Design a protein around this ligand. Structure first.
Ligand SMILES: *[B]1(O[C]C2=[C][C]=C(C([N])=[N+])[C]=[C]2)O[C][C]O1
Ligand SMILES: [Ca+2]
Length: 223
């Protein structure tokens, strides 16, 4: 997260880290057994780390639960990042408390201008790299599908939303991929792609979660 602030510890209780020896993507807890993330974050072994703030220090809220099942969207395109969504079933249910909670799935798509909260342990610099220990947060509005298309001509499917600041300086970045964008208490985005990070006219592009409610609830019911 570039141009953010450090979240209050555990104020984002649905944020997970996906760990493959180290943090490589984010994800969101949507059921005691299920995390949603981006299909481009797929690996055959993932340990899910819940209740993190400092991913470099054990603070005693952490639950480390390996993935039992990892299901990419059947139509995920590795090239255009269309349908950039996957589900991860945990090998045991996460205990839900104040520090580990679910986030609702959307009941409608969000309007342009809706304030959202974006989080992760991705890079914090627009120039070079600094990967933080502490979970970063960013308040950011949903952008118009028109404004998102003008930023990226012919690259935005209907399964994509822009969220951010056309001016630059405030965006997610590499290592936030797969993590949440939550607006009015609903998971509306998954950190997907962008041309660099926090550049002028290149806002973050996010998978549009309100297109996928049927697919998610089906995969859960079947597995
Ligand atoms: B991600 O990184 C991809 C990424 C995430 C966010 C932006 C952005 N908002 N400008 C750009 C690229 O995927 C694999 C590792 O983290
Ligand atoms: Ca920790």
């Amino acid at each position: 997260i570039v141009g953010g602030y450090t979240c209050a510890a555990n104020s984002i209780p649905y944020q997970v880290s996906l760990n493959s020896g180290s943090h490589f993507c984010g994800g969101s807890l949507i059921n005691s057994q299920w995390v949603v993330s981006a299909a481009h974050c797929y690996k055959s072994r993932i340990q899910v780390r819940l209740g993190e703030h400092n991913i470099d220090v054990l603070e005693g809220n952490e639950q480390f639960i390996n993935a039992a099942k990892i299901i990419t969207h059947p139509n995920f395109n590795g090239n255009t990042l269309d349908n950039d969504i996957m589900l991860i079933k945990l090998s045991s249910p996460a205990t839900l408390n104040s520090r580990v909670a679910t986030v609702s799935l959307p009941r409608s798509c969000a309007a342009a201008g809706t304030e959202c909260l974006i989080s992760g342990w991705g890079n914090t610099k627009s120039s070079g790299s600094s990967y933080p220990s502490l979970l970063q947060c960013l308040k950011a509005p949903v952008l118009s599908d028109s404004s998102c298309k003008s930023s990226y001509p012919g690259q935005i499917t209907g399964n994509m939303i822009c969220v951010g600041f056309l001016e630059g300086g405030k965006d997610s970045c590499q290592g936030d991929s797969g993590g949440p964008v939550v607006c009015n208490g609903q998971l509306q985005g998954i950190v997907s792609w962008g041309y660099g990070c926090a550049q002028k006219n290149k806002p973050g592009v996010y998978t549009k979660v309100c297109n996928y409610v049927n697919w998610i609830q089906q995969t859960i019911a079947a597995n």
